[PDB]
């Protein structure tokens, strides 16, 4: 479980949009640096940058 | 924000 540092804007069909303090599950690294997300925030799933999230506490 | 990754 990650948290997200920042507000990121979709910029794909298959990205995820996220807020800055969502609660995200990282589902696996198949697009390397970018990592398919699940927010259990908003039920959402896509990739993500994987330098704008760090590991929840 | 830092920059995007490579995809």
Same mark, same amino acid.
């Given at each position: 479980? *990650? #948290?997200?540092?920042?507000?990121? #804007?979709? @910029?794909? &069909? $298959?990205? !995820?949009? *996220?807020?800055?303090? &969502? @609660? !995200?599950?990282? #589902? %696996? %690294?198949? &697009?390397?640096?970018?990592?398919?997300?699940?927010?259990?925030? $908003? =039920?959402?799933? =896509?990739?993500? +940058?994987? %330098?704008? #999230?760090?590991?929840?506490? | 924000?830092?920059? !995007? +990754?490579? @995809?």
């Amino acid at each position: 479980t *990650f #948290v997200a540092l920042y507000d990121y #804007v979709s @910029r794909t &069909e $298959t990205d !995820l949009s *996220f807020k800055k303090g &969502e @609660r !995200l599950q990282i #589902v %696996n %690294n198949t &697009e390397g640096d970018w990592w398919l997300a699940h927010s259990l925030t $908003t =039920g959402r799933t =896509g990739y993500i +940058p994987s %330098n704008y #999230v760090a590991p929840s506490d | 924000a830092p920059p !995007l +990754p490579p @995809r």
